[PDB]
Design a binder for this molecule. Structure first.
Ligand code: ATP
Ligand code: K
Ligand code: K
Ligand code: K
Ligand code: MG
Ligand code: MG
Ligand code: MG
Ligand code: MG
Ligand code: MG
Ligand code: MG
Ligand code: MG
Ligand code: MG
Ligand code: MG
Ligand code: MG
Ligand code: MG
Ligand code: MG
Ligand code: MG
Ligand code: MG
Ligand code: MG
Ligand code: MG
Ligand code: MG
Ligand code: MG
Ligand code: MG
Lengths: 50, 380, 108, 110, 157, 113, 131, 47, 78
RNA sequence: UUUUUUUUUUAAACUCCGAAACAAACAAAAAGGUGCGUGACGCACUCACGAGGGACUGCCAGUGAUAUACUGGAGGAAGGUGGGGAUGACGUCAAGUCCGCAUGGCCCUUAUGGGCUGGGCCACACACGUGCUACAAUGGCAAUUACAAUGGGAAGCAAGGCUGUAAGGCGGAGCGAAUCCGGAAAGAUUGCCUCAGUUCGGAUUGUUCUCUGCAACUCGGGAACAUGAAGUUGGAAUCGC
């Protein structure tokens, strides 16, 4: 599905971002919500992840 | 089907001669049959506790752990290893339950460790010992089931998310062993049970609460939750509150796959006409009733690393800082006992057994029990 | 260093850094050729390349450290080829070609 | 089940089967099922109240035959105003700048 | 050694057994992706290894039942193409046997639609009792060699 | 001591297309001598002025850099600076870092503490 | 060795590029960095926390070092002036954290004194006796 | 508690002070601005 | 705000002063946008060779002027 | 756990005396668990940079015209051209380039010169060449979790943070850079899909936007949602390794 611009593989092929691919801010938000922390916590987090 | 048949006949011929039940350096491989799980002492460490699979499923009606099932399907024998860590956990909860007539026991314990070290088997053996002593144990061998699958509706009073099918599954799994005991235990909270949204049927028309009868026991409350899909979540919450008020028998909460309650769930909430937001497991009503360890109940929650939970904080929320305990892998002696057991159960040929070979398997697996049991048939 | 079988890779246990079994087998093969399993506490730092390249680099470093500990162990390590540095590296792309060797499609 | 203006299959899971509705794709099916509090289930296992809720959720989006008529009327508006895209639509030609020298075979025939 | 490092680490093999394992892993690897095919071969090893017995000797005896003694080659003489029989070398015998076994197993997967480990173990078992599609291929090649045996001495190799 | 010079000092960074070790006589006296990794820029151009696309010639521009540390004191800084402004390093562009220390007058901020 | 006189020690950085060919301007010329240890400023804990909030990531906690670099002005001496002006501004704003702490501490004490049924009678008597 | 109030109230009001000290541009609503085109170097003489 | 597009539609500068008085004559500016105030006017739009006559209606608002004067002849093969 | 034999050591702090009644932990010092660092020592080690060594059929055995060689072996990181590149004879194709440049001759000089705007080089019954994406389960997708090297950065790269479903918008810690700046993917773990023109494959088209630019109609990039073509492994033939 490298020709499909609505998927992550196609957006990587086109070198773009969106809902399917997402920038690194999406990873930051998801891992802040996963660890039950406020979104104003500075990145990288002042916690040990095990 | 002739492949397994020869090993089955050889194992049936092995049990007639009791001299083949040997371990390392001529030790007896199995515990004596008169010994139960409460009578295990330090001289039984490294030996094997034989079970009966029908009896084991009777004591554990919520389902055997997947590690127990895998080990039983590979060994063709209902037996488990007596380790020092299980005896330490059992002695810890025994000293909590009754003090003997400076190691401070811990009421809340999180069983953490490397993957496939034996956390699920230790938890199941602890539940077997606790139910042998007649304890009110709510055992959840699949804690990932609490957060995955089914329906989810937002509570209009508390703001949490209700899962009715999972709640009724929890209640059925509890009652499946605790039916004789819950009939003899009276409810200590007599507030009415607030009804919620049913599984695909919405609210109940005209009825908002179910009152608690004066003579009702805990079995009546659990059956009220089972029979009505509009009250199962509230009955699970009331059961959590009622388990802290039981004074006749010890109460133990055992949750396997406990780290799934600190990550996201399967469910997502539409917060925007173009967007959805994942719902955390802590927002589920059953989990929010059951996750916290900041109380005085005897609760044990074992983590799992086979599930793709990922990385959590070392300082877990709503957990005491000293609750986490390291469950280790096999040592040299436990690995030697395991390899001699697999020799006894004919997982490996007798002609290709040596100290160097099982030491090679142990050092390759680095104490991983599943990898060790997978590598013994490849021994030459 | 002599010990009881500890193996650390980048301050992590080696079954965490290399969870695949064949990578760990390739790591522990030079210890098994000299029959010195469980007698070493190995701490190693590895960087660059991919997973099999890092496994091969750690294997070569283990073999060289075993040779440095006792030179009489060189015979079993040289017989298995563990002391030979694998010099095969990625060949450079040439101009006028699609790859290092693969050519463009030529019209007959 | 007749949802929108299309037949959702009974034996298929609903998230797959809801994409049979015109105007609903992979994203909007997940959005609608998230609005219903359903992860995934078979379409024949729906309750009645779930059916009113499902027909209400699809009704918030433009869908079905009225959406088909809207798209057709927009194309006909482009044709009847005689802009450049309308002339490409009328002639059976690509209207997004694609080449017609070699590779207009989808807009043309085989 | 590059393929199946677990078998090399617990080394009780010889050159032919290592080559057989390497050819069984490597023949169906595509795009430089070893791990899934190697896992399939590992589970095919594991299915009879958990019931005592020596799986390596079993597969050595299974490959031997598929090893083709004679093969045929196309030689054009005076504008008409003949069929010249020839002797198969031992490495080519092993390669052809393992190739036919993997062809039979993967066509059995694409026909019956079950797990690939099941098809591989089933076809190796068929090879062990001198039957199955690989044995039919060996029989067909031997029949083609014996049929065109009068066109020998047209040989060049 | 082989430890790092962390005080009042002059650091010299020399950038050239050629190695400064080829003419080391024109280097200023120094306490430490360090080198940066080489950096190149690849240029691939067509050989023919017309259509011979598969024929290319490849050139590079390799950058070389050296780091020099001169331990000094605060009084012998302008005197060293005067002669440093007039050096002639062969085929190079040199770069003077100055690390000097003063003391902070807290008299206009002592009232606010 | 340390600098003369008394006070906390500053640590300046400066660069000169000697380009050949009679065009001496270079983009690296104007940048000036100034470093200081925050513990040598004699600030309290609240003042240090307000300084850390004002500064952000220019402060390094491991070295206890505050680094102010200035490049927004065209000349080296202007950036050297700007570094010290920024340091005085940051010290002046960080010093306000003592008064805020005193104000909210006396607000907390006064709010707690109103939640005491034995204090209001004496307070009312003292404000009635003098009016 | 008093300690949390002490630690929280000392770090308030620092946005305007930071923007005044460092000469920053304050755009709290985040509308489009001519600041990003007026902060780059002119290049007309270079060209 | 009420605006859904933050950027104004482009119009050349000669149409920004005399407005509809410039739209009763020949227009070379195919890049301008047809405004809602341009309705009920006749323009002659240059296509490269000739000024193609166009009558501005309600349905032409928001388009470019060059969308109604084709530059290549629709062509046929013998 | 005790029995001995031999050697050394003997103001602080109480549950005490005296108070506070408002919680505090405050100008530093006073405790226990921790997370991220730093200095000093260094530069063992990796790496960088400069200069070198090492491989030459040098040694051994055999075949052979004792020659040149060939076939093995030892040692060695590397063995016989160690891998790869650069390096391209006389001439041939009146091979290509007057549209990179320069040039002899011929030709134009209110035009075949110079400028602007607009269009075209992007057309379209078809044919040919080079590629990209696929036709799927040796897979598609989601979550979790690992491992690079080459390079680039002031008309710039832009950390953290705020806003938007998203592309984007705001703002700017540091960096003219071994210092500062951009989640490698295949891989692995868990789960869904279960052989369908499908959760394969994303052509075509609609609507709503966004970036760059004086200007995105002909004729740009990108986002969102929807639309969901052909294609189910390809004849003769032909390419690369
Ligand atoms: N006491 C034991 N007796 C026998 N086999 C055991 C024992 N403990 C562990 N094993 C073996 O190790 C395997 C892993 O055990 P288990 O499933 O309990 O792991 P776990 O520590 O809970 O790991 P996970 O992180 O995967 O949840 C078992 O399937 C079994 O083969
Ligand atoms: K076109
Ligand atoms: K050479
Ligand atoms: K356009
Ligand atoms: Mg797809
Ligand atoms: Mg950011
Ligand atoms: Mg955001
Ligand atoms: Mg487990
Ligand atoms: Mg490559
Ligand atoms: Mg290279
Ligand atoms: Mg650079
Ligand atoms: Mg050195
Ligand atoms: Mg040799
Ligand atoms: Mg010619
Ligand atoms: Mg020509
Ligand atoms: Mg022009
Ligand atoms: Mg800045
Ligand atoms: Mg993948
Ligand atoms: Mg999988
Ligand atoms: Mg599809
Ligand atoms: Mg656009
Ligand atoms: Mg078709
Ligand atoms: Mg198919």
């Amino acid at each position: 599905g490298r020709g499909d611009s609505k998927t992550k593989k196609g957006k990587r092929f086109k070198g773009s971002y969106g809902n399917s691919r997402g920038k690194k801010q999406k990873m930051i938000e998801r891992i802040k919500d996963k660890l039950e922390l406020p979104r104003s916590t500075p990145w990288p987090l002042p916690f040990k992840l095990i | 089907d002739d492949l397994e048949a020869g090993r089955a006949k050889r194992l049936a011929d092995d049990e007639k001669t009791p001299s083949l039940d040997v371990g390392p350096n001529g030790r007896p491989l199995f515990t004596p049959r008169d010994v139960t799980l409460s009578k295990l002492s330090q001289k039984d460490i490294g030996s094997y506790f034989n079970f009966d699979e029908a009896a084991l499923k009777a004591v554990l009606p919520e389902g055997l752990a997947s590690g127990i099932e895998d080990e039983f399907k590979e060994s063709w024998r209902p037996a488990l290893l007596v380790r020092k860590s299980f005896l330490d956990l059992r002695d810890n909860f025994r000293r909590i339950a009754d003090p003997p007539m400076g190691v401070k026991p811990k009421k809340q314990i999180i069983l953490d460790g490397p993957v496939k070290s034996g956390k699920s088997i230790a938890l199941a053996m602890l539940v077997h010992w606790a139910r042998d002593e007649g304890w009110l144990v709510l055992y959840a061998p699949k804690g990932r089931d609490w957060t995955h699958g089914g329906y989810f509706y937002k509570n209009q009073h508390t703001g949490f998310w209700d899962t009715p099918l999972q709640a009724e599954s929890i209640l059925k799994d509890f009652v499946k062993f605790n039916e004789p005991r819950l009939r003899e235990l009276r409810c200590n909270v007599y507030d009415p049970i607030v009804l919620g949204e049913g599984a695909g049927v919405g609210y109940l028309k005209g009825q908002e609460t179910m009152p608690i009868p004066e003579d009702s026991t805990l079995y009546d409350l659990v059956q009220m939750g089972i029979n009505s899909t509009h009250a199962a979540v509230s009955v699970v919450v009331r059961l959590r509150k009622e388990l802290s008020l039981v004074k006749d028998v010890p109460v133990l909460i055992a949750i396997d796959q406990y780290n799934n309650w600190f990550t996201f769930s399967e469910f997502e909430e539409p917060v925007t006409p173009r967007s959805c937001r994942p719902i955390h497991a802590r927002e589920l009503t059953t989990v929010n009733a059951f996750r916290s360890m900041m109380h005085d109940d005897m609760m044990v929650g074992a983590f799992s690393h086979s599930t793709a939970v990922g990385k959590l904080r070392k300082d877990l929320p709503d957990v005491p800082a000293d609750a986490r305990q390291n469950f280790p892998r096999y040592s040299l002696d436990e690995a030697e006992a395991v390899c001699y057991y697999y020799l006894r159960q004919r997982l490996v040929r007798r002609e290709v057994f040596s100290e160097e070979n099982w030491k090679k398997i142990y050092y390759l697996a680095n104490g991983n029990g599943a990898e060790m049991r997978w590598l013994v048939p490849f021994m030459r | 260093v002599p010990g009881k079988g500890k193996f650390l890779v980048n301050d992590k246990e080696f079954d965490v850094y290399f969870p695949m079994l064949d990578h760990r087998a390739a790591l522990l093969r030079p210890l098994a050729e000299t029959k010195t399993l469980g007698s070493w506490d190995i701490n190693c730092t590895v960087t660059g390349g991919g997973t099999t390249g890092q496994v091969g680099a750690i294997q070569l470093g283990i073999s060289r450290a075993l040779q440095n500990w006792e030179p009489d162990m060189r015979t079993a390590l040289r017989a298995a080829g563990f002391l030979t540095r694998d010099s095969r590296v990625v060949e450079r792309k040439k101009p006028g070609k699609a790859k290092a060797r693969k050519s463009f499609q030529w019209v007959k | 089940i007749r949802v929108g203006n299309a037949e959702v299959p009974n034996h298929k899971p609903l998230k797959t089967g809801l994409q049979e509705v015109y105007g609903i794709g992979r994203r909007k099916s997940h959005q609608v099922l998230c609005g219903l509090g359903i992860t995934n289930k078979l379409a024949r296992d729906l309750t009645g109240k779930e059916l009113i809720d499902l027909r209400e959720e699809v009704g918030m989006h433009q869908h079905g035959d009225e959406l088909r008529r809207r798209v057709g009327s927009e194309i006909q508006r482009l044709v009847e105003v005689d802009c450049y895209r309308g002339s490409r639509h009328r002639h059976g030609m690509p209207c997004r700048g694609q080449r017609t020298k070699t590779n207009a075979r989808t807009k043309k025939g085989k | 050694x590059x393929x199946x490092x677990x078998x090399x680490x617990x080394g009780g093999l010889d050159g032919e057994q290592k080559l057989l394992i390497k050819k069984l892993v490597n023949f169906r690897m595509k795009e430089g992706k070893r791990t899934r095919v190697r896992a399939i071969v590992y589970q095919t090893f594991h299915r009879p290894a958990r019931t005592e017995r020596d799986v390596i000797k079993l597969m050595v005896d299974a490959v031997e039942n598929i090893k083709p003694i004679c093969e045929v080659a196309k030689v054009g003489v005076a504008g008409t193409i003949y069929d010249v029989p020839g002797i198969v070398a031992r490495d080519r015998q092993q390669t052809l046997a393992i190739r036919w076994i993997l062809e039979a197993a993967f066509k059995r997967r694409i026909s019956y639609r079950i797990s690939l480990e099941k098809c591989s173990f089933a076809e190796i078992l068929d090879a062990y009792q001198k039957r199955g599609s690989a044995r039919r291929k060996r029989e067909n090649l031997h029949g083609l060699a014996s049929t065109n045996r009068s066109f020998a001495h047209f040989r060049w190799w | 001591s082989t430890s790092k010079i962390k005080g009042t000092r002059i650091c010299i960074a020399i950038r050239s297309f050629d190695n400064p070790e080829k003419e080391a006589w024109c280097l200023p006296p120094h306490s430490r001598y360090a080198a940066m990794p080489d950096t190149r820029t690849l240029y691939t151009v067509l050989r023919s002025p017309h259509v011979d696309k598969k024929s290319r010639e490849q050139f590079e521009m390799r950058f070389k850099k050296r780091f020099l540390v001169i331990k000094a004191q605060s009084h012998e800084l302008s005197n060293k600076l005067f002669w440093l402004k007039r050096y002639r390093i062969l085929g190079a562009q040199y770069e003077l870092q100055f690390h000097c220390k003063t003391r902070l007058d807290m008299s206009p901020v002592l009232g606010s503490k | 060795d340390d600098p003369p006189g008394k006070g906390p020690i500053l640590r300046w950085q400066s660069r000169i590029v000697f380009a050949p060919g009679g065009d001496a301007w270079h983009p690296k010329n104007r940048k000036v960095k100034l470093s200081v240890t925050v513990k040598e400023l004699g600030l309290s804990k609240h003042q240090a926390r307000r300084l850390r909030e004002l500064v952000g990531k220019r402060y390094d906690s491991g070295k206890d070092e505050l680094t102010i670099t200035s490049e927004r002005f065209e000349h080296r001496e202007e950036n050297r002036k700007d570094c010290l002006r920024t340091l005085y501004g940051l010290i002046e704003e960080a010093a306000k954290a003592n008064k805020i702490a005193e104000d909210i501490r006396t607000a907390y004490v006064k709010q707690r004194l109103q939640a005491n049924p034995a204090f209001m009678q004496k307070l009312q008597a003292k404000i009635m006796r003098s009016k | 508690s008093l300690k949390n109030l002490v630690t929280s109230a000392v770090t308030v009001g620092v946005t305007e002070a930071r923007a005044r000290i460092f000469g920053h541009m304050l755009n709290p609503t985040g509308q489009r601005s001519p600041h990003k085109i007026l902060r780059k170097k002119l290049f007309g003489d270079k060209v | 705000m009420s605006r859904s597009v933050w950027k104004d539609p482009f119009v050349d500068a000669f149409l920004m002063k005399k407005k509809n008085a410039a739209l009763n004559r020949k227009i070379w500016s195919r890049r301008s946008t047809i405004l809602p105030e341009y309705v009920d006017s006749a323009v002659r739009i240059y296509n490269g060779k000739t000024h193609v006559r166009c009558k501005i209606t309600e349905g032409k608002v928001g388009h470019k002027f060059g969308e109604f004067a084709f530059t290549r002849k629709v062509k046929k093969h013998a």
